[PDB]
Design an enzyme around this catalytic site. Structure first.
Site, mmCIF file in Angstrom:
data_model
loop_
_atom_site.group_PDB
_atom_site.id
_atom_site.type_symbol
_atom_site.label_atom_id
_atom_site.label_comp_id
_atom_site.label_asym_id
_atom_site.label_seq_id
_atom_site.Cartn_x
_atom_site.Cartn_y
_atom_site.Cartn_z
ATOM 1 N N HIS A 1 0.571 -1.136 0.050
ATOM 2 C CA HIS A 1 0.082 0.029 0.204
ATOM 3 C C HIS A 1 0.843 1.373 0.091
ATOM 4 O O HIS A 1 0.338 2.308 -0.155
ATOM 5 C CB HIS A 1 -0.914 -0.034 1.036
ATOM 6 C CG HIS A 1 -2.081 -0.920 1.463
ATOM 7 N ND1 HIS A 1 -1.786 -2.237 1.729
ATOM 8 C CD2 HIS A 1 -3.295 -1.073 0.647
ATOM 9 C CE1 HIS A 1 -2.927 -2.991 1.527
ATOM 10 N NE2 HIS A 1 -3.649 -2.144 0.804
ATOM 11 N N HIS B 1 -1.786 -13.172 -2.640
ATOM 12 C CA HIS B 1 -2.784 -13.945 -2.028
ATOM 13 C C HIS B 1 -2.218 -15.358 -1.573
ATOM 14 O O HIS B 1 -3.221 -16.073 -0.752
ATOM 15 C CB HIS B 1 -3.985 -14.169 -2.731
ATOM 16 C CG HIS B 1 -4.980 -13.118 -3.020
ATOM 17 N ND1 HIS B 1 -6.221 -12.924 -4.068
ATOM 18 C CD2 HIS B 1 -5.223 -11.831 -2.150
ATOM 19 C CE1 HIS B 1 -6.792 -12.087 -3.818
ATOM 20 N NE2 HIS B 1 -6.318 -11.322 -2.850
#
Lengths: 553, 550
Positions: free
Chosen positions: B67, B166
């Site tokens: 992020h 993931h």
């Protein structure tokens, strides 16, 4: 949050001059004998754009200089003619003069001198002028009510009783309408404000007398105008140019000139040894030196350590400069040392009390650093003098009083901003960048300078030692900060055991909980960053001490 | 009006490190063989104040380095890693031991990378040097491909990044379970995009069959994500940087020849000025080559010499039609004449000749003005072939509006002066340098399509402050208001049009903050000051993308 962009206002990267524009060797070479003629030739002409008011532009530039110099507000010092940018279609009319000089005449000097020359050339004899206003890089009618309104709006300008009447009469005109105001009855309809002089009994002690002594009106109006345009310029050493008067006035906070050869280096060493051998705690000398040299306004250039007024009545009675614990003992000791060195002086070498205050501060820092394991030398440039009580204007040094000091954990009741925008404002006044603010806060907390010697912010295990222990222990995450049960504003911090260890105020934890301030503290409180902190603190302290020296060079 | 405070962002007065500290000489002296151990010891713990994970803080520092690196907007370059506050209290026991030798961006990003490498993986490499200041089968697929094309990611690196992110939070447990039993949500379902979209599925099935390729693809994708806005490969410090170069870095060939100096410079300057090239051609070409630089992701610049290559010659601002082919042919012919007939193993590269032509043109113009100066020139640039530049990657560096060249193209999100301010902010130019460069480029002659918009000089091809003297002149009245719209014009007291201006020129004579910086160069005795400061600004602009010399 805090606006830390105010500290670096007007940097040296937006300056088109950079590093070779000392604005004292250029304007001292100006040709005032010929600049006045150029100003007269520019002003006594008409233009197609902006047509002339009966020719002469004198009224225009006089009212312009007045409305540019009447912004000075004493409560913080900002305003005046030397700051900011206060019609600006004149800068398209005075350009044919600035073109011939350029960098030797800033816009503020040119506008104010245009006003002064307009006054001089409209049948008058002004007092004098001084260049050196550097250019900022963003360039119902009721007699009593009107009287009190003008009295208040000039009391904010520091115009007292005779300068107010002189300024009003001159601006509306050396008598040309004083005889008008006493000629007949006066009526009203749907200007009578000038009748306040005829009505207010305090004004009548001078105004009615001015009908019999017109030359007094001229003299006091000249002095009032000279005060008006030079109020926001500083003590009389920035007054450049071959126009300044030969006398000094009591509103300038004058200091006596040097009548004794300055101390050299062996004398500095001897005095530094004689100070810290008299039994003075580091928390006394550092506190006194900071107290003397942290009453400075970088906007009005008024205050500073020069003159040595910390022993005088206006600055010893302040509650910040607590005159109960140690500000009489320290001053008596330094005065005794000064007398001892002056009596048995080696030749014509003498030391003035301001020099001894700053020297005591420097020697205390040197001793603390030597006790902290390092070996540093604090630069000291002598030359300060001592101003007597007759030259201090006890009623003028009442706004320089710090209502809240951030580097000493002083917070007086009745503050506009809660506890850390006042610190930011103070650091802006002293003209301190953010790293200098942070290093000064850390050094002063560690050394011991807090008001009333409170342990609010002293994070050091063993005081009287200049270390970064205020920075190492602030970032330590073995301590959690919560407001104290006694909600006085303190933020007592507890460790993992559950016992209180430290204690802080809003200033210490706003350094420890901001973003930019947290970055600076992380820079200064790392491992093997003690020498960098010591050098940076010595540089910041020297800059603070010499703040009011370069402009009193 | 304008916000001139954006130009002087992050000054040297607010930097606690002084002007004598350089990051490159410090961070190269740390041992990354022990910083990894310290990071691993810090990230395997349970601090009481911050509720820890199971036993490892890693899965929180990959999502923190992501992020902080997935906010890179290609349309202007700002964002990325180089540009919580509860991790800053956790990585402190590592930054404490280093301090000046490890900036916060490098430390956080390296903590993320080390956590990824210590969770059963083999990453690509690292380089220090980041200084610090709803049923949607296809809708989800198009949204993710758009939001990853905004960060300039391919159709293989997107799938690699999704699968890896993931998975780390080879194992390939995110693909084997993807097809196990009628997998469908009937309330994650966004992951079905790989399983439905044919473009994704074409490589996704191969990855399910060739798992070892997924590791390499994700390693390259993560390396791209971390170092996307760090700059050319010459900014990568530390001993971890890989030995190979990738096509997304805009690589340039290394120097394979000696460097011209102090006599070949004079010979080449004479040969350039003796080839019948107008000053308005050489200056325009040099500016075009060296003013496509984004000082936010450090991508662009004159290095590599791509002004002759397809991505940067087709741009309308460079104007390939009128004069960008004759200049390039002449400079290439000069290069071929000076290469083979060179005295020894000395050679000159085409980017060097572009910048040298710019400098020689400025020298000739200034000598015509009446001065005698020398424009410093530091060689070292090379030429990048066509196979080493991407047509699709460079299509965003195209300036849709150039203020110094007085170019304004259709589709303007902002007025004509805020675009100039943004461009001068990208080049990292302070306000005096912006004003001086505008004046010098107007006087010299560099306007797009050679329009006489802003040329206030009576006789061009002469570096003088005549754009500043004639702008402040009050004998000319601008018929439309200097701040409404359109192109203005200057009429004297006789009612005849004298000068023609534009919204970019008439801001340096109507903005109270910028009209102060034209009265310093527009004075009577400030001609040599203007010449010297223009040479300084031009050298700064030319040497913006010289990272291998510093």
């Amino acid at each position: 949050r805090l606006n830390l962009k105010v500290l670096h206002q007007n940097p040296a990267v937006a300056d088109p001059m950079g590093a070779a524009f000392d604005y004292a060797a250029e304007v001292a070479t100006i040709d005032v004998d010929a600049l006045t003629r150029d100003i007269e030739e520019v002003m006594t002409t008409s233009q197609p754009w902006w047509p002339a008011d009966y020719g002469h532009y004198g009224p225009l530039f006089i009212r312009m200089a007045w409305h540019a110099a009447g912004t000075y507000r004493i409560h913080d010092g900002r305003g005046g003619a030397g700051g900011g940018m206060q019609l600006d279609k004149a800068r398209r009319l005075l350009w044919p003069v600035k073109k011939k000089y350029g960098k030797k005449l800033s816009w503020a000097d040119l506008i104010v001198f245009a006003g002064n020359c307009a006054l001089e050339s409209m049948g008058f004899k002004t007092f004098g002028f001084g260049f050196g206003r550097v250019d900022q890089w963003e360039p119902n009618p009721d007699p009593m009510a009107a009287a009190v309104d003008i009295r208040e709006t000039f009391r904010r300008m520091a115009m007292n009783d005779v300068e107010t009447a002189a300024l009003i009469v001159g601006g509306h005109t050396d008598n040309s309408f004083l005889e008008i105001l006493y000629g007949y009855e006066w009526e009203l309809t749907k200007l009578a404000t000038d009748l306040s002089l005829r009505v207010d009994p305090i004004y009548e002690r001078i105004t009615r007398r001015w009908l019999e002594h017109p030359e007094e009106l001229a003299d006091e109006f000249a002095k009032a105008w000279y005060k008006l345009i030079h109020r926001d310029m500083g003590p009389v050493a920035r007054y450049l140019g071959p126009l300044v008067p030969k006398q000094t006035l009591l509103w300038q906070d004058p200091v006596p000139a040097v009548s004794h050869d300055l101390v050299g280096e062996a004398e500095i060493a001897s005095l530094k040894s004689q100070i810290r051998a008299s039994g003075l705690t580091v928390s006394q000398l550092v506190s006194t030196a900071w107290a003397a040299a942290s009453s400075f306004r970088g906007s009005d250039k008024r205050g500073g350590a020069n003159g040595g007024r910390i022993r005088l009545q206006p600055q010893v009675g302040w509650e910040v400069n607590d005159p109960d614990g140690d500000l009489r003992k320290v001053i008596r000791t330094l005065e005794e040392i000064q007398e001892s060195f002056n009596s048995a002086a080696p030749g014509n070498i003498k030391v003035s009390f301001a020099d001894l205050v700053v020297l005591g501060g420097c020697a205390a820092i040197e001793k603390a650093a030597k006790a902290a394991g390092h070996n540093i030398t604090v630069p000291f440039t002598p030359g300060r003098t001592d101003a007597s009580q007759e030259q201090t204007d006890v009623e003028s040094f009442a706004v320089l009083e710090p209502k809240a000091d951030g580097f000493r954990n002083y917070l007086g009741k009745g503050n506009p901003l809660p506890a850390e925008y006042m610190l930011l404002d103070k650091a802006n006044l002293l003209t301190l960048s953010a790293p200098e603010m942070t290093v000064l806060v850390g050094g002063l907390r560690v050394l011991g300078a807090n008001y009333k010697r409170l342990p609010l912010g002293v994070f050091t295990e063993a005081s009287e030692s200049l270390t970064n222990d205020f920075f190492v222990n602030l970032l330590d995450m073995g301590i959690t900060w919560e407001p104290s049960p006694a909600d006085d504003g303190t933020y007592q911090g507890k460790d993992g055991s559950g016992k209180v260890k430290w204690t802080g105020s809003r200033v210490d934890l706003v350094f420890g909980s901001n973003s930019e301030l947290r970055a600076l503290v992380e820079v200064y409180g790392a491992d093997d960053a003690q020498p960098k902190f010591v050098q940076d603190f010595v540089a910041a302290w020297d800059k603070v001490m010499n703040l009011d020296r370069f402009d009193v060079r």
